[PDB]
Amino acid sequence: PDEITTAWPVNVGPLNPHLYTPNQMFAQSMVYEPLVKYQADGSVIPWLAKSWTHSEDGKTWTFTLRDDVKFSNGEPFDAEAAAENFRAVLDNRQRHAWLELANQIVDVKALSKTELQITLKSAYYPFLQELALPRPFRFIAPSQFKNHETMNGIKAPIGTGPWILQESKLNQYDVFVRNENYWGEKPAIKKITFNVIPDPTTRAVAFETGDIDLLYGNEGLLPLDTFARFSQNPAYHTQLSQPIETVMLALNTAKAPTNELAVREALNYAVNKKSLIDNALYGTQQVADTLFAPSVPYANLGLKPSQYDPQKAKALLEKAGWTLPAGKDIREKNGQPLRIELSFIGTDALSKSMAEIIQADMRQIGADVSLIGEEESSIYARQRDGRFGMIFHRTWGAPYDPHAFLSSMRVPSHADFQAQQGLADKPLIDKEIGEVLATHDETQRQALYRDILTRLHDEAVYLPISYISMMVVSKPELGNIPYAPIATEIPFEQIKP
């Protein structure tokens, strides 16, 4: 009643607030809290910090913390506790370099029990937004550090948030209960059980049979045909949010044949996106023409779409000297056939379906795409070392898009750095990314974003496919399910049946 049961593909992990895999972000966000909180309108509000001031040069920030906050174990949250957390994070700073705030922070110190001072090496504009992220800048009770650190593990996952991990039963379920001593609003739900269910179809079956009350996630939540069927069945409730992020291919500008502008341009006219969405996605997503949707901050640039046009694709390839030998359907140039490898997580049924469609569309224009589906670790390795022709990718949703996604293009962890290595203006782009993040002249900031996104668009680095939405399937008794502003978060505390 005031207890609900939902599902997740894996256990939540140890809930170290400062580390990545195998910690599940939604669970870190349930237990741990930020100094300031991200809102749908793009702003942040006071959270663990009541208020703040900054110096004139924008480099020194002083946060006045709430004085009534306790960790779930009764220990006080104060500036000392906050400063220790920042220390623990930055001791592992190499692991956070994709996130520019982690490179920017030069000092953190408690000026008193309620005053926290953070010094940056430049006037980093997205400072507050990055403090608001699910990780790594959230607070565990320092008593729960191991050997004065968190980077090598924690003891109990003690946060200040409205949920407390009750128990974690491997391959069965994770249980969270309401924090009865939470500083803020008391959630109506008292207990949330996450059944561990890795298979999309099995999750749907689990819901159909009534075993679980709620499913909340992105386009991989459950099979989309089943989602469509559920939406017409009055016994169930379903929701589909407005789009939150882009799904796209990254094309390797430093590997033949995607190293050729003409090829990447042709590939951008080759995919019938509407058909792909209608066919493989059951019409539940939107066609994307650009890396970021026009509704993304700084991204309403009037970039010119490349609409499905196989005739144009062919002309582009022919003009570039990719012509068809007699009796063949695959183009060649300088002896070399027009062959391209498409990489994706092989156990991702949706990615695989989209890949087959893309392979077929590209064959129609004389390009031989080979599908390379592999396990995560193998795909991740490819992202880092640039061993891909085309690779499935996605942006990160609010508040990461666009600033943090772009920041990340500067380092080899996601594929973007590798994908862009073949561009003569890659150094210029990376420099401008550095600049825009520290620009407070609003005209220059917009100018820099325009130049960066326009170069990426004109150089055909990406093949945008669709903008995807969050999806919800729930027992009607739970009522309308709200969305959390941050795509990886689940607003359990706002569920009020």
From Swiss-Prot:
Its main location: periplasm. The keyword Chaperone does not apply. One of its GO terms (molecular function) is peptide transmembrane transporter activity. Keywords: Nickel, Periplasm, Signal, Transport. It holds the Pfam family SBP_bac_5. Involved in a nickel transport system, probably represents the nickel binder. Belongs to the bacterial solute-binding protein 5 family. This is Nickel-binding periplasmic protein.
